[PDB]
C-alpha cells in the first residue's frame, strides 16, 4: 500500500493506496460451495496413485 | 533502416495474447450473462509480416 508511484513537487508522494485497494488473498468469488443449503467451503481430499 | 530496426519491429509487432472476462466480480449489476474478451496480437499469415 506504500509503494510510491509519483514523487510530488511538495516532497510528498503518490502511493498505491490511493489509486487502488490492496487485498490479501480473499478472492475466488468465481465459485461457491454449499452443504445442505448452507454456505460452506468444500475441501476435496484425493488419493495418490499407488 | 538497419537490420536491428527490422529485428526490433518483427519482435514487438508479432506479440502474444491477452484475455479477460466481463462479469467477473459479483458486485456491479445483475447481468444474467458472462462473456470472455481476448486480444490477439499475433500474426497468422505471411501477409501480416
Automatic annotation (TrEMBL), chain A:
It is found in: Cell inner membrane. It comes from the Bacteria. Belongs to the resistance-nodulation-cell division (RND) (TC 2.A.6) family. This is CmeB. It comes from Campylobacter jejuni. The gene is cmeB. The chain holds residues 249 to 298 of 1040 of the full protein.
